[PDB]
Amino acid sequence: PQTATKHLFVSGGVASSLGKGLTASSLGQLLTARGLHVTMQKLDPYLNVDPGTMNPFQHGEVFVTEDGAETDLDVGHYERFLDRNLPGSANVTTGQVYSTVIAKERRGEYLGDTVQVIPHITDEIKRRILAMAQPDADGNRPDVVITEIGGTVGDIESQPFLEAARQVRHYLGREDVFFLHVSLVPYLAPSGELKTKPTQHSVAALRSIGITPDALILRCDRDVPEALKNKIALMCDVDIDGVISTPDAPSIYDIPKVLHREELDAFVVRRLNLPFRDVDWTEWDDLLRRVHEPHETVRIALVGKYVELSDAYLSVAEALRAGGFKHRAKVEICWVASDGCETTSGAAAALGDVHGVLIPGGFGIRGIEGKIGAIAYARARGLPVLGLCLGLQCIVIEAARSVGLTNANSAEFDPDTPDPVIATMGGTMRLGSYPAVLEPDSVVAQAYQTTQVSERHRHRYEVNNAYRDKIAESGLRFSGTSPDGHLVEFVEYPPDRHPFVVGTQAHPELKSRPTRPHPLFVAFVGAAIDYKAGE
Amino acid sequence: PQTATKHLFVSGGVASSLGKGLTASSLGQLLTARGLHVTMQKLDPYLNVDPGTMNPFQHGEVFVTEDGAETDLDVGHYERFLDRNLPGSANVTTGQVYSTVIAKERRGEYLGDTVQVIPHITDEIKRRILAMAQPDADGNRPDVVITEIGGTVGDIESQPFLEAARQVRHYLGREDVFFLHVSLVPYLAPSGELKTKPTQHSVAALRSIGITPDALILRCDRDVPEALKNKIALMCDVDIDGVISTPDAPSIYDIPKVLHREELDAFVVRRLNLPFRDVDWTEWDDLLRRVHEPHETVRIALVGKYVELSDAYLSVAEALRAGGFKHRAKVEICWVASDGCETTSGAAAALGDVHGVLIPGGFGIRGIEGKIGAIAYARARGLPVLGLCLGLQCIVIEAARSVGLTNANSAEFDPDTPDPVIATMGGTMRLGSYPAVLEPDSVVAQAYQTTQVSERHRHRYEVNNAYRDKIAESGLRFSGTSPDGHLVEFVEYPPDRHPFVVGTQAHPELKSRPTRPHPLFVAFVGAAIDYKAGE
Amino acid sequence: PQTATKHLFVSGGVASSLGKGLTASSLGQLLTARGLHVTMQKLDPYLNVDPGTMNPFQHGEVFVTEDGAETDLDVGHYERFLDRNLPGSANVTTGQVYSTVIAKERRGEYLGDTVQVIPHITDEIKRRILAMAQPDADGNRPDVVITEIGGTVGDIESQPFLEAARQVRHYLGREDVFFLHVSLVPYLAPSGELKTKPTQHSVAALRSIGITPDALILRCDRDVPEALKNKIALMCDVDIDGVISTPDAPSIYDIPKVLHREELDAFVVRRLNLPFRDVDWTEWDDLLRRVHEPHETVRIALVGKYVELSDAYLSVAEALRAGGFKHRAKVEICWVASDGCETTSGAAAALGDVHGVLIPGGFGIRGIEGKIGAIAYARARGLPVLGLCLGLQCIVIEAARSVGLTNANSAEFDPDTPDPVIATMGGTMRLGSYPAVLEPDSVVAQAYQTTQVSERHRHRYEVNNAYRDKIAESGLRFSGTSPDGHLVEFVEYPPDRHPFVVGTQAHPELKSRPTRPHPLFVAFVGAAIDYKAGE
């Protein structure tokens, strides 16, 4: 019979941004390849009940699940490395826990007690952790749950989750629980030395709350010397087999290979006494060939907020690269500002050297006229264009203005527009998976190679059915809809008007994986390659 | 012009139950007698949004304000020592703060930030503290706000409030902020020595969070020797003028005299540079004469949960003593269990030696038949009876059963009763002050010496107007009502049926003060004295 | 009259090696240039009573004072920036403090008390701090004492000194005491962001022991953005005028200019209310011209332990550069291993491209045959050579072997040598300043331009007076001696044998300053320049 389910806790020291979520994802990929069944959880110590209120240009994109949960973006790294649809239960926040305990208290469920952080908050967190280990709807019980604890050890907001993880160690014992601690080793250029003292103080801080790490991951810009690992092992009371050197890798897809070279997964498997097996690399070896040995390069403009990389489009950038991997092409992202495209000369300057334009969606944007300028320029030049949610809305507005409805706009951006071609059907936010039907041999039907699809949604405005007949005077096809046809889901131009100009109301980048590119990103990068070839 | 408003923070170490709320009340009484205007606040670190859910026999009574807030009972010590109606704003809890910040977050008011314990929770607490210093509805600004921080220094739940108090010290400076720290000095009988080490570790804990105490209150069963106070002052870095010895006093009304003997208030006034004046003792000297030199003793049965003192009836016990002070009588409380009175022989055993029976109210009780037995016995013996809220309901039920409605009951305790003489007008809980009119020369009108009164409410059942005519066949008078007569507020028997048997739907014990006894408790203890005299 | 003496405490966070000793030296240079009288102290938390036992290749050179104290090398940065002879009292260690308190205890001086860390150790440290503020032998009282506390805030060994510094703040008050805190801001290359969290946790650690910093020095590889300094100031409760950005400078002599650009000294002068004045830069501007705009470059071989920079020769490297500054020459140090010079072909490989050879001294070396090979090669090539202490001993041994005493050696390295030309006069270690007389118009007399000098000593072997007549058959002159002639202090070859081959038994690099080059290093770098010119 199957063993007891193991719990592995991932924690971080010195600083955030050390990549412990990619560490947890790579350890999940490794343990999955050894034949274990892994499930994953993130704990977020912030008080927002979900990141749907948070600014994505400051705090990164909101990930959306099939069940329509708005989650932290680390759940997207879990999805991309596991290739699994994760539930909304995969993300916990302090705001959810406190709101739940206070609601139970106001209903009288604690039978007249004083309600406290310990036990009642830590009990709610511990319940949410132990719930992950229960059998799924198909009867499968995980072999391990990997739980990543957000923040830094030493943060006031981190303390309840670390106390609950300690209580899980006490309840299940050291045979069923493993603690992995991520820490920074800085280099000082004037004296030319790596400093171990920050890791020592971080492990001392962790020990002061009753947790001893089973392994240390040392984050550094260069390989940590053996003598320094020995000093760390000695001072931190950690097995030298558990002090792992992890210099920064060229891509996130190398991290599994790095962790396997150091034998972290073998250390974990031995320590937890799990059913050992060798890793099979064949598919991740094919991935890394497509990563590191591309046959060609193509440039995609991303018409976003600013001319620099932002986690606001992390999953769009990853989906573009994955769509390139299918062709063995390097997709270089040219981050273009929306506002430089507002003038037609400015558009021709910024969007001039690129081979495709992507118009990304999301909340946290105000004003869209520059994106409509980018679309108009791209259609004039004959570039391929992929518009995601708001990109569809901009394509429909640009079409409406092209048919002479010069003041036509989204009611979200001109409530006084005489022709609200985009309007609420504040309306209702559509969230999560909805089905669609595609017109046969429509461009999107060729991309999916089917007439029936489902995609994840996060929007509250719809294409105005009152304007369809006028918009269609451009030749635009409402080629994909809700199954009743009531809602437009996809728009396309026929192939003889433009080679590929497509918008979708959905967020398909959330369904993409490096091992399984999404069909539209494949077809879009294909049209970009064909443009570069024809130009 | 008036100075800046000072903030004095009261905090506790080693343990709870050290009496820091009575300390804060006595310091408020002293500073008021020197002519300063004092206002008071309590911070409760528990997550209950109010104690209305908490069991009063475990956690003490719920105090009720004029504006109908359910508050912690320490607000009642503030009311009794200040003789001031305090607002609901006088009590803050962690549950209120978190519920408020989470509601603001879900409304988008933090403009896309990550919401954190620091700043946003500590900012909400600091706002609630600094709000106390604003002018009242009559334009009066307090000279000092005294803020008592609940829990013990070292509790996880205490940390946000202590951090906010530190931020107030940083914002206003040491000239406007004073920290008072209450601590325990234990005596060890085998070695015969007082131990200073617990206070040293408590002050070290306080210093580790950035607060240095301005004075230490040492709680002990015996007077602390001068050499020990010197050792404490030396080790704790506290001015020897600020190490105060406070042995346990015979009554809570002695604590002001004790604190003045040690010159704590003079130390505070000097340190804060407040307008000095002498205390006038004349009224508190008259109080302490009525406390310590009573002319006679009378026994009042309290028919409560159990035969021992409980904070579930703290304000009823204090109101009974205050009602005795008017007569210069010692009122000795005979705590009687409800259940020993269920049999008539058991009632005659427990309620046999007493001169009056009080039937107290509250939530947290189930079953009332023993209290109805107590009332029936007391009316048979001819004892005086005062029934508070539920005591009125029991008196009305006992009357209904006496007129032959043998199964008549409260629907709260027999939902299947054929004659629900007490019923909901789950109904609506009446809270706070409501007016009443009293029948002229009714017994209650003689007690108040008026026909118009207002009293605080906390109940959701009413006397059934359908049964008034039948209940009145006992001779019961509905002598006090709501101003329309729709609701019964007071019941009495005429004086020739019984000397004093009164119930009120209100909680008059909340309006009582030691310096200002409530009229009904005066009239009840008077009827008890008259019974002892006649018997 | 002069004000009270101010105490400024320098402390470090996150890691050691952040350069807080050069920070303290540069602040001393700045405050001296504004006309204040500064004196300096270092506290070392290690238990060694002095570093004379510690390995200099692991822990850096031992500095030697005029009074013959063996001290930490930071006292040499104090000497070079102040140009002051510092006492042995300038360095305190835990070993000295504990040895002193335990000796007092064993003598009964604590009158039968229990001896404790607090008070007695912290009292001894506080006494050693406050002693620095007493008038010197000429009656001058310092305006400020700058005290650098070694280690990192969070180290167990640091805690007594930080507690004593807190007690000094409490005793003298915030008007007389300033706390400067040095901290690291790391850069993470994968995400491209500077992290403030390590500084926040470091300041929180400092606050947890009762110290609030008056200013933060942020150590970084790049200039910290204004928004990050604002975040730090906000979270750490530090005045934004006191958050100082200090990227790594090209040389240690730029740090004063960097700290003045940020106005740290003006912030300090204002905060301490010291007599303000402008800095005069004229001499440090001339220094920085000689640093940054040299007219030529010359290569000096250093025949040390290893082919890389070591703090074992920090003051020798600085003395060589200072000796170059006089000529406006860049002296590039070619670090050469002793052992590569053991074969004559290996010597001709390693010492081939250089223009002068320096043979440095010290303890912590075993075996000298490679240095004798280097000297023999250099004399054959005709290179100039400067031998410091052991370098003199090697020159005398090389001479003895050149006159045919093939087995002649130091008894320290061959106790069985038949001809111990270097021997103990374990002998007595000579420490500190001793006088010497120089033969008139000897090469050393031309260098000093005098016949009478004093130099610092740290050695226990002497030139064997029994061998002088034989060694002189080489033509070597014992041109400098003790005043009686009993001890050889300097050896030279006459100018027609070699242009400059000099050894001294002393450590003249300890008397050198960048503003005042030592005469021998001037004459040696001059002979190296002349060789490069003639070759």
Ligand SMILES: O=c1ccn([C@@H]2O[C@H](COP(=O)(O)OP(=O)(O)OP(=O)(O)O)[C@@H](O)[C@H]2O)c(=O)[nH]1
């Ligand atoms: O992965 C996570 C998840 C959540 N959080 C939570 O976000 C909040 C901010 O935590 P930060 O680490 O971001 O602190 P900071 O921004 O102010 O400092 P630096 O960037 O300069 O380094 C904290 O409450 C933390 O618990 C994380 O830090 N990391």
Ligand SMILES: O=c1ccn([C@@H]2O[C@H](COP(=O)(O)OP(=O)(O)OP(=O)(O)O)[C@@H](O)[C@H]2O)c(=O)[nH]1
């Ligand atoms: O059994 C022992 C042995 C040794 N010591 C050592 O004696 C020193 C004094 O430790 P104390 O416990 O006696 O502190 P204190 O006297 O100042 O406080 P109180 O009596 O009022 O409670 C401390 O350094 C301690 O470590 C003990 O306390 N107990």
Ligand SMILES: O=c1ccn([C@@H]2O[C@H](COP(=O)(O)OP(=O)(O)OP(=O)(O)O)[C@@H](O)[C@H]2O)c(=O)[nH]1
């Ligand atoms: O300037 C000083 C003086 C003295 N010390 C004392 O030396 C001892 C070692 O303190 P370290 O800072 O050197 O710790 P570490 O070597 O083991 O860690 P890393 O180098 O890798 O960063 C500690 O006891 C400290 O108090 C310093 O660290 N710095």
Ligand SMILES: c1ccc(-c2csc(Nc3nc4cc5c(cc4s3)OCO5)n2)nc1
């Ligand atoms: C956002 C931010 C960064 C990146 C990005 C691109 S490449 C790269 N390199 C990395 N190497 C390691 C190596 C680790 C580790 C984490 C990382 S991250 O934890 C275990 O050892 N990070 N992408 C988007």
Ligand SMILES: c1ccc(-c2csc(Nc3nc4cc5c(cc4s3)OCO5)n2)nc1
């Ligand atoms: C509930 C619980 C107790 C009592 C009760 C009855 S008598 C008594 N004696 C006391 N003396 C002091 C002296 C203090 C002090 C607090 C107290 S409490 O803080 C400052 O110094 N406590 N009543 C109801």
Ligand SMILES: c1ccc(-c2csc(Nc3nc4cc5c(cc4s3)OCO5)n2)nc1
């Ligand atoms: C041994 C080790 C290093 C060096 C060396 C050579 S150059 C250089 N650059 C530096 N810049 C700053 C800037 C600071 C500071 C310290 C330093 S050290 O604290 C205040 O701001 N360090 N030499 C011998």
Ligand SMILES: NC(=O)CC[C@H](N)C(=O)O
């Ligand atoms: N996710 C998005 O791109 C949203 C686009 C637009 N604000 C809408 O709600 O329809």
Ligand SMILES: NC(=O)CC[C@H](N)C(=O)O
């Ligand atoms: N406060 C009370 O005594 C409440 C009594 C009764 N449970 C009611 O609600 O009417």
Ligand SMILES: NC(=O)CC[C@H](N)C(=O)O
């Ligand atoms: N300081 C030194 O170079 C010492 C050299 C040699 N060991 C001696 O004592 O004489």
Ligand SMILES: [Mg+2]
């Ligand atoms: Mg070290």
Ligand SMILES: [Mg+2]
């Ligand atoms: Mg003792």
Ligand SMILES: [Mg+2]
């Ligand atoms: Mg941040």
